[PDB]
Amino acid sequence: DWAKANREVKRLQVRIAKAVKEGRWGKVKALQWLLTHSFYGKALAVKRVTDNSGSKTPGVDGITWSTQEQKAQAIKSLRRRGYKPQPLRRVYIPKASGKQRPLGIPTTKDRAMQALYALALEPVAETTADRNSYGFRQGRCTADAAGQCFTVLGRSDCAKYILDADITGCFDNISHEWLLDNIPLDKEVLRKWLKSGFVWKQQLFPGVISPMLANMTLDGMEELLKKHLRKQKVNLIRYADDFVVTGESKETLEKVTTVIQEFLKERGLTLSEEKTKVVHIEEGFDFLGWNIRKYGEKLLIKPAKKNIKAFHKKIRDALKELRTATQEAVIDTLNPIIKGWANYHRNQVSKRIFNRADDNIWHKLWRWAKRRHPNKPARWTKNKYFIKIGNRHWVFGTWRSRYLIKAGDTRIQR
RNA sequence: UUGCGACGCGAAAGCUAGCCAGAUGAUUGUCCCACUAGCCCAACAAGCUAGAACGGGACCGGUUGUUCCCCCAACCGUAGCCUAGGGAGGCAUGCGUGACUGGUAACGGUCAGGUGUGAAGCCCUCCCGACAAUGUAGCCCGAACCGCAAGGUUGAAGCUGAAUCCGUGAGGAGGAAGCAACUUCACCAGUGUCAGGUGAUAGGGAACUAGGCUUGAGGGUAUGGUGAGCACAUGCGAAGUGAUGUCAGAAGCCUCGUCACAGACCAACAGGCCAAAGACACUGAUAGGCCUGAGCCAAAACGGCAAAUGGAUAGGCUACAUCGCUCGCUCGUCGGUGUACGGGGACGUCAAUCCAUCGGGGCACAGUCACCACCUAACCCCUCGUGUCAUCUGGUUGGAACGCGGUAAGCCCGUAUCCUCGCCUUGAACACUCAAGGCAGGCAAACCGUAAGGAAUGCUGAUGGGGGUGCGGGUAUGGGAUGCAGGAGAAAGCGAAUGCCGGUCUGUAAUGGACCGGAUAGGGGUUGAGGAGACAAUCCAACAUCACCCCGCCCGAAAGGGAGCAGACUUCCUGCUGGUCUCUCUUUGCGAGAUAGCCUGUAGAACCUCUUGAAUGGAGACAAGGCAAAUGGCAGUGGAACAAACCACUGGUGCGGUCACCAACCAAACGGCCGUGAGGUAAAGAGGCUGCAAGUGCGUAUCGCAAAGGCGUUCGCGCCGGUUCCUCUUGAAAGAGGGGCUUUGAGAGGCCUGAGCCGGAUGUGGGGAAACUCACAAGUCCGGUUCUUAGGGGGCGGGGAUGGCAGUAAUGCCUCCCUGCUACCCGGC
DNA sequence: GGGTTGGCCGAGCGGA
Ligand SMILES: [Mg+2]
Ligand SMILES: [Mg+2]
Ligand SMILES: [Mg+2]
Ligand SMILES: [Mg+2]
Ligand SMILES: [Mg+2]
Ligand SMILES: [Mg+2]
Ligand SMILES: [Mg+2]
Ligand SMILES: [Mg+2]
Ligand SMILES: [Mg+2]
Ligand SMILES: [Mg+2]
Ligand SMILES: [Mg+2]
Ligand SMILES: [Mg+2]
Ligand SMILES: [Mg+2]
Ligand SMILES: [Mg+2]
Ligand SMILES: [Mg+2]
Ligand SMILES: [Mg+2]
Ligand SMILES: [Mg+2]
Ligand SMILES: [Mg+2]
Ligand SMILES: [Mg+2]
Ligand SMILES: [Mg+2]
Ligand SMILES: [Mg+2]
Ligand SMILES: [Mg+2]
Ligand SMILES: [Mg+2]
Ligand SMILES: [Mg+2]
Ligand SMILES: [Mg+2]
Ligand SMILES: [Mg+2]
Ligand SMILES: [Mg+2]
Ligand SMILES: [Mg+2]
Ligand SMILES: [Mg+2]
Ligand SMILES: [Mg+2]
Ligand SMILES: [Mg+2]
Ligand SMILES: [Mg+2]
Ligand code: NA
């Protein structure tokens, strides 16, 4: 099946996008209508449901037996006409960073319809979106937001004034009428969705279809900031909801404040007064964990000290849990944490920050090894827990050698 | 489950505490006199010894008084003893292992030799003994060239040290002879050589570690301690007061300075220098090398200035306190602080050395800070006194984990005695009949299991098994954690108590203490303990908690076993019990909250059927920000040369809108209007049936959480919390604000293990001068307390599952569950 | 503005 079921869907996605590169929204709505009423679209929809850890919804359906795939997909073969979405189930997943962050879970049939119209929406939200919008799109990392911050703010390639903005309104605070007016999908399905209390009201508009909506609602910013015409003055860089704007002066960024607040005025959104601030590089703004400053005609994207303190909080808590552990288990928990904070900051100025990070986790590991055996000397723990692994002594681990990854040895790529 | 630890006793023996009294040694540099000793052997004295004998004078050495010098002052002394520490024996004991032996068995006794332990409650003698082990973060060494390996030559931090010389002497000056680790790297302004130097390191060394007592008593005095442990919203508790803090973390500490680890380093880059920078050559004039810097001056190149903001200082094997990035307590070296530390002189002081306030990181076995009450007196001050310290001896009161004692109910074994006793299948004969065999059961264990124990095999299989009782032999063994009550048995104690039971007074939070009263044992005979008696002649006496025989009574049939109050400790049996936690359902709070159905309108061009009627059926091009009830698992073109597989490219599927059709049906023009064809043909309405829209179902099925109250009360409420939901904020388990509530039951099921702490009575050791602290199973014992829900594995007995193997079958056997026991092992304290 | 390696004082009694 799936050796062609992805293929026909993706070809028809290509045809939707080729429709939107000319006007032809009749062609677009025809191919959306057709792809939604395709067997392959429905089969893909139930695969995307079954591969996201389905659990108890209100309208409980199963996942298993490899026939309820065919049962449910023939069920939504009919189901466009009498489709009534049932409301959500208020499910708390206990995040390991502070709460049980709530996440309203739809019905499996409702999330299958969401996956259907998600593969309908995607090739329109590719082409009609921005070109400096990096949130939640295809093929785009948050590192590319830093790359756009680089080739915007480089060797005097801006003029030193940047607006650090952010958008209020927690939920999909968008006026429902605006969504129903201009979104390239069938207004009856979206009409039934927005009535239903669509996503549970602790949602932060960054459940598959809601990023497609929250990208489509924020795609006029780049065009309406080509109302200003200078050389490299206005550049907008936006990751999913958190954007910063460039400029050349304090009052022209206030033109940009009034412009963007008129833009979001039509929708249900307002920029804040707190989180919005104008700032002069070099005084720095925080953007996706990376501090951007200048430090005297350098650029120096550095990972900010609120993305370092969060990483030390993660390792501090990983060892406050493993307080009586085995040494190889301590390597096993602490090693992908450091590798994930390595591959994420490996394109920026981070090597100095990596040596300070390995320093601080080393002191945590030393306090680990010394709190292990209280009344026992120090040369014992140094040669029992730490290995001369090379030129380096003090390399934590045991055993072919099992040992932590020094984040400082992770080879920053230009 | 920790080497032992329970309980009574100290009859006796040996450790041990308090007190009393004696004896002995000692009371710690040298000399001179003072006093006394062997002192006139002439009481003169010149001369001999010892001196807490507690005197004075003059001197030696050491340490402190901040490096060196010269004074001065205080303190210490080469003596005796004790301990830590080391060595060597015996001795005792724990666990094994073989050899022998008792006994019917259960179970023992004895030697050997293998390994432990001998102690903070628990071995004896001897020797070395304040010298040493032992340790170390700072300091010092850790070379210098001959050269075959490093062999030697020398050096060498340093150790030890004679000869000599001075002084009455303590001592002072020299250091011959001897001993001694020295191993491996890196940097020097390119490379190589040679010279001249610096920094890690194996080890070595210095330094300390390396003790204590030898003058007491009172009074004042704290820099020295204590005032529980826990939780915290409230508190429990006999056990200060009040703040403040709990993981987005107080106090303390390690770092570091706004880009906030090594006041880092190397590379890059930028600015400057230099002529290969100690020489001798090679190479390079510019990247050739070096300096400085994510700040600045520099420049022959000596290096300096500020380093977030202020601020301080000279010289420490000094003493005390703290700290060196977090368990408590005692220590060793080294380093930083803070307080205290005579007179003069010389040398000369400051380096990013240190402190303080902010600020960035961190570190977390939860305390901290202030006050109050009380304790102790080292030091100092004051008063009084002449001793003090160690050991041994004797007395006396005590104690114990050391020494002694107790078999009895439990269990095992033997003995006599009463009761019970199979099961199958076949040949069954006279019908119970009986056989033959296997089972079930009784005994050995080869072998396995560290271990609980099990099992091959063999042995027996009513000639034998099992249960009950009465005896006899053996062995029961030692932990506070949930009490209590009853029974079996009950050591020591008492023929009148140390116990018991009443009574009186009194103390603690609780255990307690003193005193008065009361009960409490069949007989005889015997040995004849032991005292009597002028005596050994009397030659006794019955109790010596009763040594041994018969009757009174019980029990048993017998042998006999028993029988007065308490009756400790360990056991065994029976009953009633406690606490807390996990899971499931229930009920209530907060939030969410539907589909099917029922109903009222709406739409159906893209859903059907039917009735209809200018009112039908099948198909093309063009478009398409209008819509939809099968749909793109569709079709076409091309690549394969069209062909077989696969791959590129195109497609709006339908309704609607416009041109444009094909089938099927005709208004008008037309000879009495019989006939004709050029020409015209797109609705409405009823049934279901799907959707929509509201309502009812319904605050319901169901889902996510949660069940926590206290205090003031002025009775209205308020504050502190808890719980659910919403909103702001934060990277974040933090916070801010708001709404509600402030709240029930049952079910089975775990589990009894530990941490301590306080008081009292006793012991021991480290620290301390002492209070007091840290430990000895919470020291132990009793008493009072909170807290932890209290760990895995394995085995044996019973009832089932009970699928198979073996099976004529009895049934066992590998596999599951329920249930009883188990210290049987590895934790753990 | 990338590239390397540091950190370790010992004894003893008793515990979370
Ligand atoms: Mg005695
Ligand atoms: Mg004497
Ligand atoms: Mg002197
Ligand atoms: Mg002086
Ligand atoms: Mg010996
Ligand atoms: Mg001495
Ligand atoms: Mg050296
Ligand atoms: Mg050498
Ligand atoms: Mg050394
Ligand atoms: Mg000495
Ligand atoms: Mg005081
Ligand atoms: Mg500083
Ligand atoms: Mg800086
Ligand atoms: Mg500097
Ligand atoms: Mg000194
Ligand atoms: Mg006093
Ligand atoms: Mg006693
Ligand atoms: Mg005892
Ligand atoms: Mg006991
Ligand atoms: Mg025991
Ligand atoms: Mg008790
Ligand atoms: Mg009893
Ligand atoms: Mg007795
Ligand atoms: Mg009496
Ligand atoms: Mg009484
Ligand atoms: Mg009761
Ligand atoms: Mg009940
Ligand atoms: Mg005591
Ligand atoms: Mg002990
Ligand atoms: Mg006690
Ligand atoms: Mg313990
Ligand atoms: Mg203990
Ligand atoms: Na426990």
Across all strands, nucleotide nearest A124 (CA–C1'): B625
Residue A224 has a CB neighbour count (10 Å cut-off) of: 14
Per DSSP, the three-state class of A167 is strand
Q: For residue A358, give every residue at least 6 positions away whose Cβ sits within 8 Å of its Cβ, in sequence order, or none.
A: A406, A407, A408
Q: Give backbone dihedrals phi and psi of A146, rounded to 5 degrees, phi first.
A: -70, -35
Residue (of A226, A221, A213) closest to A165 by Cα position: A221
CA A340 to CA A246: how far, in whole Å? 30
Across all strands, nucleotide nearest A366 (CA–C1'): C7
DSSP string, A98-125: SS-EEEEE--HHHHHHHHHHHHHHHHHH
Question: Which amino acid does the sequence have at A364?
Answer: K
Which residues 313-352 on A are within 7 A of strand C at the CB atom?
348-352
Per DSSP, the three-state class of A169 is coil
Q: Give backbone dihedrals phi and psi of A168, rounded to 5 degrees, phi first.
A: -85, -175
Contact A358, A312 (CB under 8 A): no
A190: Cβ under 7 Å from strand C?
Answer: no
A66: Cβ under 7 Å from strand C?
Answer: no
Can you state the percent helix, strand and coil of chain A, rounding each to 5?
45, 10, 45
Contact A239, A145 (CB under 8 A): yes
Residue (of A56, A90, A85) closest to A201 by Cα position: A90
Q: CA of A309 vs C1' of B127, distance in Å?
A: 69
Enumerate domains of chain A plus CATH numbers.
2-128+177-199 (no CATH), 162-168+213-302 (3.30.70.270), 305-409 (no CATH)
Tokens, residue A79: 């189901």
Whole-number Å distance, alpha carbon A296 to ligand 17 midpoint, is 89
Residues of chain A immediately before an interruption (C to N > 2.5 Å): 206, 399
What was the experiment behind these coordinates? Answer: cryo-EM
Distances from the Cα of A236 to the Cα of A148, A166, A248, A274, angstroms: 9, 13, 13, 20
Across all strands, nucleotide nearest A99 (CA–C1'): B733
Tokens, residue A330: 């301590």
Nucleotides on strand C lying under 7 Å from protein C-beta: 1-16
Residue (of A255, A183, A251, A169) closest to A32 by Cα position: A183
Q: For residue A120, give every residue at least 6 positions away whose Cβ sits within 8 Å of its Cβ, in sequence order, or none.
A: A16, A32, A35, A36, A41, A185
